[PDB]
Design a protein around this ligand. Structure first.
Ligand SMILES: *[C@H]1O[C@H](CO)[C@@H](O[C@H]2O[C@H](CO)[C@@H](O[C@@H]3O[C@H](CO)[C@@H](O)[C@H](O)[C@@H]3O)[C@H](O)[C@H]2NC(C)=O)[C@H](O)[C@H]1NC(C)=O
Ligand SMILES: *[C@@H]1O[C@H](CO)[C@@H](O)[C@H](O)[C@H]1NC(C)=O
Lengths: 372, 101
């Protein structure tokens, strides 16, 4: 029972309601605790510090803190701003860093102690192109909300010079309701293949709009790049005869996957949901799944590195951790079945470029698989 | 201590200093353009460098004055997208076909 701690960082409600990532992480540590098949001779505790959103200095101090007690590695906050702080901390003091949310890849950041289980945007976007190419649409239209969606689709944006197409680009304005006039001009625009890069919450806040202006008829077809396509409040709209298509690395075929899903669903509406928002209560989200998997890959590596030690280091003792060399390499080289399927780490840019994707579509009944 | 600070050139590294000065009230000035995140509430930072937003408006004006009917945009790294988003939104308003490499 080798004791170990994992740094926990959560940009959260800063209030009573507890966030999903903390939940899945603790769910994860419990999962370790019950099944000893992984780590028969080892059990890992954890320290979970909590910070504010888009607030670097506070995160950095907390980073020094979870250094003070010592762990193997941190779990990155889910927003890039302080994420950069975290990363420039980790590789600065040698402790491997694991990230879940996509960050803006800085082209020349020579950091080396980081990976990201998130489906890297490039592969996703390439699949997007293959998909739209199959459906033989021409006047496609993107709508994002903030800046980084364009980046997520850059591979999409560069397509026209090789592929005969067109696409205007339209913006959801600052607040969600503001999208009604956008739908107005799109109605004027008559753009019948509009792909969306947007947070599924905003997807909900705009589907009410689209049905409200009656735009959802059988001609229109939308494809939603987001990965929590599962928990959409699908039921009323599927009888608008519309066509939707999307992806889900979130496997459901494994019965173990299911069983863990219902265990979650017991612990999940345990947290008070927002049914008024129009989200299907009782379904764990893609990010939380990712960060569940991440502890498991950490474990599936560490079990083979019992030489693990926890140097109680300080931010000002600039000499890095003693054992960040082989352990990080192990994570890079490890493979596992998480809750998304196959999992590995591309050794080229220290990221992930490999996974398995089921494309899913809105059938007459709801989300039903339409390929791999 | 300083009366205030001048910013470093990058975007990413600049973020941290911006925040730090906000954590103590220092006025922070910058020199290069970066992408602001629309979800930062901070106040003590200003940019001399002209924003690329208005630049895009001017470029669009120039395009239309020449009356171009086709164009190519080329950038260095994807950040140029953010740098040009306003122009990138040309087609919705006027008859402009633009492509990117
Ligand atoms: C880890 O995965 C990386 C991504 O697959 C891979 O890097 C790169 O190599 C592949 C080709 O195997 C490229 O993927 C395609 O490349 C062709 C052009 O050859 C494109 O037409 C196609 O659209 C697609 O992009 C990636 O572009 C390229 N990516 C990077 C990051 O450079 C690594 O080689 C691989 N390394 C291992 C084995 O760990
Ligand atoms: C929806 O998908 C079906 C099956 O591919 C297709 O027959 C139908 O024409 C599509 N409707 C549109 C135009 O969105």
């Amino acid at each position: 029972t080798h004791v170990l701690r994992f740094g926990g960082i959560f940009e959260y409600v800063e209030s009573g309601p507890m966030g999903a990532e903390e939940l899945a992480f603790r769910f994860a540590v419990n999962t370790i605790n019950r099944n000893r098949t992984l780590l028969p001779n080892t059990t890992l505790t954890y320290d979970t510090q909590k910070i504010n959103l888009y607030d670097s200095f506070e995160a950095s101090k907390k980073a020094c803190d979870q250094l003070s007690l010592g762990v193997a590695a941190i779990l990155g906050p889910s927003h890039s701003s302080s994420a950069n702080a975290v990363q420039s901390i980790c590789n600065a003091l040698g402790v491997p860093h694991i990230q879940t949310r996509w960050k803006h890849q800085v082209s020349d950041n020579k950091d080396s102690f980081y990976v990201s289980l998130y489906p890297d945007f490039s592969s996703l976007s390439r699949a997007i192109l293959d998909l739209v190419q199959f459906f033989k649409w021409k006047t496609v239209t993107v709508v994002y909300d903030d800046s980084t969606g364009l980046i997520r689709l850059q591979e999409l944006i560069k397509a026209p010079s090789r592929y005969n197409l067109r696409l205007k680009i339209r913006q959801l304005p600052a607040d969600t309701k503001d999208a009604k006039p956008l739908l107005k001009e799109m109605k004027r625009g008559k753009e019948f293949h509009v792909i969306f890069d947007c947070s599924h919450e905003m997807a909900a806040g705009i589907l009410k709009q689209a049905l409200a202006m009656g735009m959802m008829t059988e001609y229109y077809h939308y494809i939603f790049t987001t990965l929590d396509l599962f928990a959409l409040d699908v039921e009323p709209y599927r009888y608008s005869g519309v066509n939707m298509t999307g992806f889900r690395i979130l496997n459901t075929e494994n019965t173990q996957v299911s069983s863990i899903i219902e265990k979650w669903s017991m612990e999940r509406l345990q947290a008070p949901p927002k049914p008024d928002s129009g989200l299907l209560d009782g379904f764990m989200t893609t990010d939380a799944a990712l960060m569940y998997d991440a502890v498991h890959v950490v474990s599936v590596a560490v079990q083979q590195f019992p030489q693990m030690t926890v140097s109680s280091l300080q931010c000002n003792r600039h000499k890095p951790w003693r054992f960040g060399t082989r352990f990080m390499s192990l994570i890079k080289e490890a493979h596992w079945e998480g809750l998304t399927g196959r999992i590995t780490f591309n050794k080229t840019n220290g990221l992930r470029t490999d996974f398995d994707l089921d494309v899913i579509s809105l059938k007459e009944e709801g989300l039903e698989k339409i390929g791999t």
